[PDB]
Each structure stands twice: as structure tokens, then as C-alpha cells.
Amino acid sequence: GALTESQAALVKSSWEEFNANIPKHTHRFFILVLEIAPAAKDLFSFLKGTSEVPQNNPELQAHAGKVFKLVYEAAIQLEVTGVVVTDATLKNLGSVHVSKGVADAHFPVVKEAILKTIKEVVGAKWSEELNSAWTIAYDELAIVIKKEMDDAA
Ligand code: HEM
Ligand SMILES: [F-]
């Protein structure tokens, strides 16, 4: 699809709609994770020892917001520039995933949980042209993190 001026306009618009409700969209995002894969729960310090996903845990919210911001920035950078740029942050990201016991096969888990989360966030505006656009941007960003984990291990 590329990333036409018209596709980019569509991701920006849909991310703005996401940030508009962090405690919701972030606790949703963790449940769609634990639905696609239950075991994933022992990984998270703030989920260990718990039974249910905490709803007002700042550690949890801060964590999940950073996740989506990073996917959106990726999409604009693709329409302007044509690419996703790897910086210090993405590199330290890769380290911390490895410490915590995260692998590649975990990533379609978190993608589906993010497409499903954005299809839920935009509702009737949803178009092929938009699904195509977030898919392009996540795939493009995951390519870059997975790269950095492999490197931290
Ligand atoms: C493009 C996709 C992804 C992005 C942008 C991303 C981003 C991040 C960030 C920014 C942090 C640190 C947050 C903090 O310091 O507060 C983090 C931590 C973590 N991530 Fe990810 N992530 C991605 C995919 C995944 C996947 C597939 C998994 C596996 C289930 C995962 C598991 C974790 C865990 C266990 C931690 C440590 C949390 C701790 O115990 O406190 N991430 N991730
Ligand atoms: F994460």
C-alpha cells in the first residue's frame, strides 16, 4: 500500500484516538494479550503474584502507552521519509526484553492484540485502507526491536 499521504493521515488520526484513553486501552491491550496467551502473565512484575490484571497500576499504564506511541511514530516516519529509524531507545528496549524472558514468537501476540485494540478504538471508520496502514507500521517497527533483542542476548 506504501504509505500514501492519505494512509498516514489515517494512522495519525487513529492514534490520537488511542491516547485519548490510556487506563482503558492499556488494560484492554493486557487482557487481549492474556487471551491470545495466558502463560504470558509470569513475565510481568506487576502481574506476578497477582491473580487478575491490575486496572490502576501506574507501572502497567506507563508501560502499555509507551508501546502504542512507538507504533504510530513509526507510520509517519514511513510516509515522510519512506522508512523506520533505529535509535538508543530501541536498542535498550531490546536488552530489557531479553532480561525478562521475552522471545520473537511473542510478537504476533502483541500485533493482533494492537490491530484488535485499534479496530476497537476507530470503530466504523475502519477501512481496508486503515488496517493496511497499522499493519504496515507494526510490522515495520517489530522488525526493528526483534532486531535489537537478538543483539542483547
Ligand atoms: C512493536 C512492539 C513492542 C514495543 C514497541 C514494546 C515496548 C516496551 C517498552 C517501551 C518496555 C519498558 C517499559 C518501562 O520501562 O516502563 C517494555 C518492557 C517489557 N516488555 Fe515490551 N514492547 C513490544 C513487544 C513486546 C512483546 C511481544 C512482549 C512479550 C510478551 C513484551 C514483554 C515485556 C516485559 C516482560 C517487560 C518488563 C516489564 C517489567 O517486568 O517491569 N514486549 N516493552
Ligand atoms: F512491552
Side-chain angles (χ1 to χ4, degrees):
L3 286 141
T4 69
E5 189 159 279
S6 81
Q7 282 173 298
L10 299 179
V11 168
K12 182 173 175 52
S13 181
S14 64
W15 181 72
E16 291 175 317
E17 294 197 66
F18 177 85
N19 210 60
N21 200 169
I22 293 301
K24 184 176 55 180
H25 289 328
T26 71
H27 159 91
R28 190 57 186 156
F29 166 73
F30 287 104
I31 295 297
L32 284 171
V33 169
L34 267 25
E35 297 188 12
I36 287 165
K41 172 185 179 290
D42 296 302
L43 300 174
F44 293 96
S45 50
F46 53 76
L47 301 177
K48 296 187 300 181
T50 80
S51 181
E52 296 186 26
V53 174
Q55 317 196 22
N56 292 89
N57 188 280
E59 266 209 67
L60 181 155
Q61 288 174 189
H63 175 111
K66 292 163 75 172
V67 175
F68 281 79
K69 196 199 57 169
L70 287 172
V71 178
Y72 154 69
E73 288 184 340
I76 307 296
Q77 190 169 248
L78 282 163
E79 189 258 330
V80 181
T81 66
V83 304
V84 179
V85 179
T86 322
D87 81 337
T89 296
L90 298 186
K91 302 208 176 64
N92 184 71
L93 280 181
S95 176
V96 39
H97 293 89
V98 176
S99 299
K100 289 308 187 172
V102 181
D104 288 350
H106 284 120
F107 297 72
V109 166
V110 170
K111 178 174 177 174
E112 303 299 309
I114 293 182
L115 287 174
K116 292 179 188 183
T117 299
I118 293 303
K119 186 178 298 184
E120 308 172 16
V121 159
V122 292
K125 300 193 300 294
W126 190 85
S127 63
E128 287 178 62
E129 186 91 298
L130 178 69
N131 182 251
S132 68
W134 274 92
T135 290
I136 295 170
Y138 184 86
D139 274 353
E140 296 302 335
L141 185 59
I143 284 177
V144 176
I145 299 172
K146 262 157 52 182
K147 188 173 68 175
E148 308 299 303
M149 284 174 54
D150 280 22
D151 291 51

